[PDB]
Design a binder for these strands. Structure first.
Length: 216
DNA sequence: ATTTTTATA
């Protein structure tokens, strides 16, 4: 299963992509690392096989994700970059060509430290894109035995994962982000994950996540 | 393929 590797600056970046858009980005990163000008491709049949879909559903997912990439940017901590520099197109039936911004390529190759790595198998069943964001941030601090302890500030999560307004007040945050995403990770990944809310007096300031691998 | 990073267990 392919190893997704990226700069920690990307794991921490402010962006908002759908689940399917992040699935495609995983494949783009693998292509970039295994090949720069940024031009990548996606075969519907291969996507369907990787993610366990019919070609019909894969084509629908891919077409919607590629269309919705229009105008999407990533913000590094600011500096903002478009993900794509041309619309995706289809040279052959079942095949799509994309041009990832060449300025984003250094976030995926030539990394010698401060990088995040995980296997595609770890994330390919996640359905919630904010749970994917959280999973990657946990992988960023994962120890060689598969465990880790990660403290994230709540205002940082809101800003970098670009949570909608309906997520940001602490009842909603706890319910819409924390509970759903942690339970999604526990259900659909090899990570076993718990958390504690830390409070500065009255205000809940950060979340301390503790995790282990199901491989124990 | 690799490594440095948070605040903390």
């Amino acid at each position: 299963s392919p190893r997704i590797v990226q700069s920690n600056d990307l794991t921490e970046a402010a962006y908002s992509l759908s689940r399917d858009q992040k699935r495609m980005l995983y494949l783009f990163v693998d292509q970039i690392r295994k090949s720069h000008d940024g031009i990548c491709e996606i075969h519907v049949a291969k996507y369907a096989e990787i993610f366990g879909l019919t070609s019909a559903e894969a084509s629908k997912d891919i077409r919607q994700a590629l269309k919705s990439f229009a105008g999407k940017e990533v913000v590094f901590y600011y500096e903002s970059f478009p993900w794509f520099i041309k619309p995706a197109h289809s040279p052959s039936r079942g095949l799509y060509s994309v041009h990832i911004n060449p300025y984003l390529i250094p976030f995926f190759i030539g990394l010698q430290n401060r990088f995040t790595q995980f296997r595609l198998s770890e994330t390919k069943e996640i359905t919630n894109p904010y749970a994917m964001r959280l999973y990657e941030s946990l992988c960023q601090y994962r120890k060689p035995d598969g465990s880790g302890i990660v403290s994230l500030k709540i205002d940082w999560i809101i800003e970098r994962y670009q949570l909608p307004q309906s997520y940001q007040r602490m009842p909603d945050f706890r319910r819409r982000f924390l509970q759903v995403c942690v339970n999604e990770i526990n259900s659909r990944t090899p990570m076993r994950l718990s958390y504690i809310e830390k409070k500065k007096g009255r205000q809940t300031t950060h979340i301390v996540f503790s995790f282990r691998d199901i491989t124990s």
